[PDB]
Amino acid sequence: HTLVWGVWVNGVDQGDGRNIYIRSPPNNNPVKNLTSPDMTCNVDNRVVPKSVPVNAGDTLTFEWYHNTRDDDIIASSHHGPIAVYIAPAASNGQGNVWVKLFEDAYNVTNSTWAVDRLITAHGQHSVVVPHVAPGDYLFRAEIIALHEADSLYSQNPIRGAQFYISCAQITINSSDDSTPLPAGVPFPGAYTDSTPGIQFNIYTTPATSYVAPPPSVWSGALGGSIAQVGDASLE
Ligand SMILES: *[C@@H]1O[C@H](CO)[C@@H](O)[C@H](O)[C@H]1NC(C)=O
Ligand SMILES: [Cl-]
Ligand SMILES: [Cl-]
Ligand SMILES: [Cl-]
Ligand SMILES: [Cl-]
Ligand SMILES: [Cl-]
Ligand SMILES: [Cl-]
Ligand SMILES: [Cl-]
Ligand SMILES: [Cl-]
Ligand SMILES: [Cl-]
Ligand SMILES: [Cl-]
Ligand SMILES: [Cl-]
Ligand SMILES: [Cl-]
Ligand SMILES: [Cl-]
Numbered sequence: 001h002t003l004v005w006g007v008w009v010n011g012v013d014q015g016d017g018r019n020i021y022i023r024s025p026p027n028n029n030p031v032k033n034l035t036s037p038d039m040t041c042n043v044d045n046r047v048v049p050k051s052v053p054v055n056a057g058d059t060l061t062f063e064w065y066h067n068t069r070d071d072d073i074i075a076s077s078h079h080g081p082i083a084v085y086i087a088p089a090a091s092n093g094q095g096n097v098w099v100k101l102f103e104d105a106y107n108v109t110n111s112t113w114a115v116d117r118l119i120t121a122h123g124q125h126s127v128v129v130p131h132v133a134p135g136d137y138l139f140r141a142e143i144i145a146l147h148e149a150d151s152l153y154s155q156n157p158i159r160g161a162q163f164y165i166s167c168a169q170i171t172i173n174s175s176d177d178s179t180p181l182p183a184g185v186p187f188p189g190a191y192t193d194s195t196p197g198i199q200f201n202i203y204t205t206p207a208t209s210y211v212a213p214p215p216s217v218w219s220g221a222l223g224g225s226i227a228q229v230g231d232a233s234l235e
Protein backbone atom coordinates (compact mmCIF):
# COMPACT_ATOMS: atom_id res chain seq x y z
CA HIS A 1 0.00 0.00 0.00
CA THR A 2 1.67 3.19 -1.24
CA LEU A 3 0.83 6.49 -3.09
CA VAL A 4 2.67 9.43 -4.75
CA TRP A 5 2.95 12.68 -2.74
CA GLY A 6 4.44 14.85 -5.45
CA VAL A 7 7.47 15.34 -7.68
CA TRP A 8 10.81 17.13 -7.55
CA VAL A 9 12.42 18.79 -10.64
CA ASN A 10 16.26 19.07 -10.58
CA GLY A 11 16.19 18.52 -6.80
CA VAL A 12 13.52 21.17 -6.14
CA ASP A 13 10.26 20.04 -4.45
CA GLN A 14 7.22 21.10 -6.58
CA GLY A 15 4.91 20.80 -3.50
CA ASP A 16 1.93 18.62 -2.61
CA GLY A 17 0.70 17.21 -5.92
CA ARG A 18 -2.25 15.15 -4.63
CA ASN A 19 -5.39 15.90 -6.75
CA ILE A 20 -3.41 18.92 -8.14
CA TYR A 21 -0.94 17.56 -10.70
CA ILE A 22 -1.24 13.82 -9.68
CA ARG A 23 -4.47 11.97 -10.70
CA SER A 24 -4.60 10.65 -7.13
CA PRO A 25 -6.86 7.71 -6.15
CA PRO A 26 -8.81 7.96 -2.87
CA ASN A 27 -6.52 5.54 -1.00
CA ASN A 28 -3.40 3.38 -1.22
CA ASN A 29 -5.22 0.12 -2.19
CA PRO A 30 -3.66 -1.87 -5.06
CA VAL A 31 -5.13 -2.51 -8.49
CA LYS A 32 -5.16 -6.27 -9.28
CA ASN A 33 -7.48 -6.71 -12.31
CA LEU A 34 -5.21 -6.75 -15.40
CA THR A 35 -8.16 -6.04 -17.75
CA SER A 36 -9.68 -3.18 -15.72
CA PRO A 37 -9.57 0.42 -16.92
CA ASP A 38 -8.12 1.11 -13.42
CA MET A 39 -4.76 -0.23 -14.85
CA THR A 40 -4.38 3.05 -16.86
CA CYS A 41 -4.05 5.66 -14.06
CA ASN A 42 -5.70 3.90 -11.06
CA VAL A 43 -9.33 4.22 -9.94
CA ASP A 44 -9.92 8.03 -10.32
CA ASN A 45 -8.50 8.87 -13.74
CA ARG A 46 -9.58 12.46 -14.57
CA VAL A 47 -7.89 15.71 -15.62
CA VAL A 48 -6.51 17.54 -12.52
CA PRO A 49 -5.96 21.29 -12.62
CA LYS A 50 -2.16 21.63 -12.95
CA SER A 51 0.77 20.27 -15.06
CA VAL A 52 4.42 20.51 -13.73
CA PRO A 53 6.71 22.29 -16.22
CA VAL A 54 10.04 20.63 -17.10
CA ASN A 55 12.56 20.77 -19.93
CA ALA A 56 14.20 17.88 -21.81
CA GLY A 57 17.25 16.74 -19.72
CA ASP A 58 15.70 17.69 -16.34
CA THR A 59 15.66 15.14 -13.52
CA LEU A 60 12.00 14.32 -12.54
CA THR A 61 11.72 12.57 -9.15
CA PHE A 62 8.57 10.80 -7.98
CA GLU A 63 8.10 10.65 -4.20
CA TRP A 64 5.99 7.80 -2.73
CA TYR A 65 4.64 7.46 0.85
CA HIS A 66 2.45 4.99 2.83
CA ASN A 67 0.25 7.05 5.27
CA THR A 68 2.20 10.31 5.77
CA ARG A 69 5.09 11.94 3.85
CA ASP A 70 8.52 10.30 4.35
CA ASP A 71 7.22 7.43 6.51
CA ASP A 72 8.03 3.68 5.97
CA ILE A 73 7.00 4.33 2.25
CA ILE A 74 5.69 0.76 1.60
CA ALA A 75 5.65 -2.51 3.59
CA SER A 76 8.97 -4.46 3.24
CA SER A 77 6.95 -7.57 2.18
CA HIS A 78 6.04 -5.80 -1.12
CA HIS A 79 9.18 -6.93 -3.08
CA GLY A 80 8.94 -6.13 -6.78
CA PRO A 81 10.05 -4.03 -9.75
CA ILE A 82 9.47 -0.33 -10.62
CA ALA A 83 8.80 1.05 -14.13
CA VAL A 84 7.96 4.51 -15.51
CA TYR A 85 6.03 5.09 -18.72
CA ILE A 86 5.17 8.26 -20.72
CA ALA A 87 2.22 9.00 -23.02
CA PRO A 88 0.94 12.15 -24.80
CA ALA A 89 -1.70 13.79 -22.58
CA ALA A 90 -4.19 14.14 -25.55
CA SER A 91 -4.55 10.26 -25.44
CA ASN A 92 -5.81 10.41 -21.81
CA GLY A 93 -3.82 7.12 -21.51
CA GLN A 94 -6.12 5.33 -24.05
CA GLY A 95 -4.78 3.34 -26.97
CA ASN A 96 -1.35 2.11 -27.88
CA VAL A 97 0.47 5.09 -26.31
CA TRP A 98 2.57 4.06 -23.27
CA VAL A 99 6.36 4.07 -23.80
CA LYS A 100 8.68 2.70 -21.12
CA LEU A 101 11.42 5.11 -19.86
CA PHE A 102 12.66 3.06 -16.90
CA GLU A 103 12.78 -0.48 -15.52
CA ASP A 104 14.41 -1.77 -12.31
CA ALA A 105 13.60 -5.29 -10.97
CA TYR A 106 16.39 -6.99 -8.95
CA ASN A 107 20.05 -5.85 -8.44
CA VAL A 108 22.23 -9.03 -8.09
CA THR A 109 25.17 -7.01 -6.58
CA ASN A 110 23.18 -5.58 -3.59
CA SER A 111 20.65 -8.54 -3.52
CA THR A 112 17.75 -5.94 -3.41
CA TRP A 113 14.55 -5.53 -5.35
CA ALA A 114 13.68 -2.05 -6.64
CA VAL A 115 11.06 -1.69 -3.85
CA ASP A 116 13.67 -2.47 -1.15
CA ARG A 117 15.92 0.38 -2.55
CA LEU A 118 12.90 2.70 -2.80
CA ILE A 119 12.37 2.43 0.99
CA THR A 120 16.08 3.31 1.57
CA ALA A 121 15.62 6.26 -0.88
CA HIS A 122 12.71 7.79 1.25
CA GLY A 123 10.29 6.90 -1.59
CA GLN A 124 12.27 8.78 -4.30
CA HIS A 125 13.00 7.54 -7.82
CA SER A 126 13.90 9.58 -10.91
CA VAL A 127 13.92 9.66 -14.73
CA VAL A 128 15.70 12.10 -17.00
CA VAL A 129 13.09 13.85 -19.18
CA PRO A 130 13.55 12.67 -22.80
CA HIS A 131 13.96 14.86 -25.91
CA VAL A 132 10.37 14.49 -27.18
CA ALA A 133 8.22 17.24 -28.66
CA PRO A 134 7.22 20.06 -26.39
CA GLY A 135 3.70 19.56 -25.05
CA ASP A 136 1.62 17.91 -22.33
CA TYR A 137 2.40 14.34 -21.17
CA LEU A 138 1.26 11.82 -18.58
CA PHE A 139 4.04 10.07 -16.67
CA ARG A 140 2.83 6.71 -15.22
CA ALA A 141 4.87 5.30 -12.31
CA GLU A 142 4.15 1.63 -11.52
CA ILE A 143 5.21 -0.58 -8.63
CA ILE A 144 4.40 -4.33 -8.82
CA ALA A 145 4.35 -6.03 -5.41
CA LEU A 146 4.93 -9.80 -5.91
CA HIS A 147 4.35 -11.15 -2.31
CA GLU A 148 1.06 -12.87 -3.46
CA ALA A 149 1.91 -13.18 -7.19
CA ASP A 150 2.31 -17.03 -7.05
CA SER A 151 -1.45 -17.04 -7.88
CA LEU A 152 -3.28 -15.17 -10.66
CA TYR A 153 -6.01 -12.69 -9.60
CA SER A 154 -8.13 -14.05 -12.51
CA GLN A 155 -8.14 -17.50 -10.79
CA ASN A 156 -7.99 -16.47 -7.09
CA PRO A 157 -9.10 -12.90 -6.43
CA ILE A 158 -7.77 -12.85 -2.90
CA ARG A 159 -4.18 -13.20 -4.22
CA GLY A 160 -2.31 -11.96 -7.36
CA ALA A 161 0.30 -9.33 -8.29
CA GLN A 162 -0.53 -5.92 -6.80
CA PHE A 163 -0.13 -2.79 -8.92
CA TYR A 164 0.46 0.67 -7.37
CA ILE A 165 -0.12 3.08 -10.28
CA SER A 166 0.20 6.89 -10.30
CA CYS A 167 -0.17 9.29 -13.24
CA ALA A 168 1.46 12.76 -13.11
CA GLN A 169 0.64 15.63 -15.48
CA ILE A 170 3.88 17.04 -16.87
CA THR A 171 4.40 19.80 -19.45
CA ILE A 172 7.65 19.72 -21.46
CA ASN A 173 8.48 23.40 -22.30
CA SER A 174 11.91 23.24 -23.98
CA SER A 175 13.14 20.34 -26.09
CA ASP A 176 15.09 19.92 -29.30
CA ASP A 177 12.74 16.98 -30.20
CA SER A 178 15.73 14.89 -31.24
CA THR A 179 13.88 11.63 -30.20
CA PRO A 180 10.18 11.91 -31.26
CA LEU A 181 8.00 9.62 -29.09
CA PRO A 182 7.02 6.36 -30.85
CA ALA A 183 3.82 4.40 -30.41
CA GLY A 184 3.73 2.26 -27.23
CA VAL A 185 1.49 -0.28 -25.44
CA PRO A 186 -2.03 -0.06 -24.02
CA PHE A 187 -2.95 -0.10 -20.31
CA PRO A 188 -5.02 -2.15 -19.78
CA GLY A 189 -3.76 -4.76 -22.30
CA ALA A 190 0.05 -4.85 -22.16
CA TYR A 191 -0.05 -7.28 -19.20
CA THR A 192 -1.94 -10.63 -19.39
CA ASP A 193 -2.01 -13.80 -17.25
CA SER A 194 0.81 -15.28 -19.43
CA THR A 195 3.08 -12.16 -19.51
CA PRO A 196 6.47 -12.88 -17.92
CA GLY A 197 6.87 -11.32 -14.45
CA ILE A 198 3.09 -11.21 -13.56
CA GLN A 199 3.00 -14.73 -11.96
CA PHE A 200 6.15 -15.49 -9.93
CA ASN A 201 6.98 -17.16 -6.58
CA ILE A 202 9.47 -14.94 -4.70
CA TYR A 203 9.68 -17.53 -1.79
CA THR A 204 10.84 -20.58 -3.89
CA THR A 205 12.32 -19.02 -7.14
CA PRO A 206 15.63 -17.09 -6.88
CA ALA A 207 15.17 -13.36 -7.70
CA THR A 208 18.00 -13.76 -10.33
CA SER A 209 15.56 -15.72 -12.59
CA TYR A 210 12.88 -12.91 -12.43
CA VAL A 211 12.12 -11.26 -15.82
CA ALA A 212 10.15 -7.95 -15.63
CA PRO A 213 7.12 -7.67 -17.89
CA PRO A 214 7.79 -6.16 -21.32
CA PRO A 215 7.85 -3.79 -23.09
CA SER A 216 11.61 -3.14 -23.01
CA VAL A 217 12.90 0.38 -22.18
CA TRP A 218 12.76 2.69 -25.23
CA SER A 219 16.23 3.45 -26.77
CA GLY A 220 15.29 7.22 -26.55
CA ALA A 221 15.17 7.02 -22.69
CA LEU A 222 18.04 8.74 -20.77
CA GLY A 223 18.05 6.67 -17.60
CA GLY A 224 17.03 7.14 -14.04
CA SER A 225 17.81 5.97 -10.55
CA ILE A 226 16.29 4.96 -7.25
CA ALA A 227 17.98 7.44 -4.89
CA GLN A 228 17.07 10.31 -2.55
CA VAL A 229 17.48 13.75 -4.27
CA GLY A 230 15.96 15.90 -1.50
CA ASP A 231 15.10 15.90 2.21
CA ALA A 232 11.32 16.28 2.70
CA SER A 233 11.85 17.00 6.46
CA LEU A 234 13.31 20.48 5.48
CA GLU A 235 10.19 20.76 3.01
C1 LIG B 1 -11.95 -7.22 -14.36
O1 LIG B 1 -12.41 -5.97 -14.83
C2 LIG B 1 -13.04 -6.20 -16.11
C3 LIG B 1 -13.20 -4.90 -16.92
O2 LIG B 1 -13.93 -3.95 -16.12
C4 LIG B 1 -14.36 -6.91 -15.74
O3 LIG B 1 -15.01 -7.25 -16.95
C5 LIG B 1 -14.14 -8.21 -14.95
O4 LIG B 1 -15.35 -8.49 -14.26
C6 LIG B 1 -13.06 -8.10 -13.86
N1 LIG B 1 -12.42 -9.37 -13.55
C7 LIG B 1 -12.47 -9.91 -12.32
C8 LIG B 1 -11.72 -11.21 -12.35
O5 LIG B 1 -13.05 -9.41 -11.31
CL1 LIG C 1 0.43 -3.00 3.10
CL1 LIG D 1 -11.80 1.52 -1.57
CL1 LIG E 1 -8.60 -4.41 -9.04
CL1 LIG F 1 -0.73 24.22 -15.08
CL1 LIG G 1 6.38 -6.19 5.88
CL1 LIG H 1 16.94 19.87 -25.60
CL1 LIG I 1 -7.13 -6.12 -21.54
CL1 LIG J 1 8.11 -18.71 -10.10
CL1 LIG K 1 14.21 -7.85 -15.79
CL1 LIG L 1 13.30 1.17 -28.73
CL1 LIG M 1 18.54 9.84 -12.38
CL1 LIG N 1 19.31 6.98 -1.50
CL1 LIG O 1 17.09 18.70 0.31
Ligand SMILES: [Cu+2]
Pocket: 001, 002, 075, 078
Ligand atom coordinates in the same frame (compact mmCIF):
# COMPACT_ATOMS: atom_id res chain seq x y z
CU1 LIG P 1 0.05 -3.14 0.38
